[PDB]
Symmetry: C2
Subunit: 117 residues, 2 copies
C-alpha cells in the first residue's frame, strides 16, 4: 500500500497517506496532510498529463498516467499514478483515492521469477 | 497477478499470460498466445490513448493509461493498463510486461477497510 486519500469537500486536500507514500517520497505528514499532491511535480513534469489528471478528477473518472515527480531531497522519479473516485449513495464524489507506483527497471531476472513454472 | 508478457523479437506477440488475464477477459490461451493484445479494443476505445501506448512501446518507456476493452462475450470494461520494458544487459528491449487492472467502483466501505486504524 502506497496511496493517498483526498477529500473532495475540502478542495482535494490529502486527508490520509499510507506509510509507503512517506517512504517513497521522503516527505513527512507535516508536508502532506491538508496539502494537494501537486507539490510533488517539478521541472519537466508533463503539462498535458497533468491536464489529463485534472480533467479526470473533474469528471469523476478513474485514471492512470506516468508523471515525473520529485522526492524531498530533489531526486526525480517516475510515478505511475492511478486515481479512482469514491462516491456516496447519492452517486456524488466525496473522495478520490490515488495509488502511486515508483517505476524501477524490470529485469530479465524479475521476469523469470514472475514466469517461472 | 493479471499480466501478460510480449516478445519484442516477434513483433510484440503475447508469449505468456497469467491466470488472472484469462479470467478477466474470458478469452482462453488459443485466443491470446501468439497474438497482439489490441484485439481487446473495440467501439469507443480512445484513439489517442492507443497512440500514447504505441509511442511508449516504440520509445522503450514505462507507461499507464485507462483504455476501454471488451471481454469475449462483448462486455465493455475499463482497463488500467500499465506497461514496462524488459531490457537485456546490452540495454536493448527484448520484452514488455503489461499489467491489466479491471476498474470497479471503489465504495466508501472499501475505503473504510483501507483506512481503518
Ligand atoms: C488522490 C490523488 C492523488 C494524487 N497523487 C498525485 C501524485 O502522487 N503526484 C502528482 O504529481 N499528482 C498527484 N495528484 C494530482 C494533483 O493533486 C492535481 O490533481 C493535478 O496536478 C492536476 O491539478 P492542477 O492542474 O490543479 O495541478 C493526485 C490527485 C489526487 C486526487
Ligand atoms: C505487454 C503489453 C500488454 C498490452 N495489453 C493490452 C491490453 O490489455 N489491452 C489493450 O487494449 N492493449 C494492450 N496492449 C497494447 C497493444 O498491444 C498495442 O500496443 C496498442 O494497441 C498500440 O499499437 P497499435 O496502434 O498498433 O494497435 C498491450 C501491449 C503490450 C506490449
Amino acid at each position: 500500500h502506497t496511496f493517498v486519500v483526498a477529500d473532495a469537500t475540502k478542495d482535494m486536500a490529502i486527508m490520509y497517506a499510507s506509510a509507503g507514500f512517506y517512504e517513497m517520497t521522503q516527505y513527512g505528514p507535516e508536508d502532506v496532510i491538508g496539502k494537494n499532491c501537486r507539490f510533488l511535480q517539478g521541472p519537466g513534469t508533463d503539462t498535458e498529463e497533468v491536464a489529463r489528471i485534472r480533467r479526470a478528477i473533474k469528471n469523476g473518472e478513474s485514471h492512470c498516467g506516468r508523471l515525473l515527480n520529485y522526492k524531498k531531497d530533489g531526486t526525480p522519479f517516475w510515478n505511475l499514478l492511478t486515481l479512482a473516485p469514491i462516491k456516496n449513495e447519492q452517486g456524488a464524489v466525496v473522495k478520490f483515492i490515488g495509488m502511486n507506483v515508483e517505476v524501477t527497471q524490470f529485469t530479465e531476472g524479475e521476469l523469470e521469477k514472475a514466469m517461472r513454472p
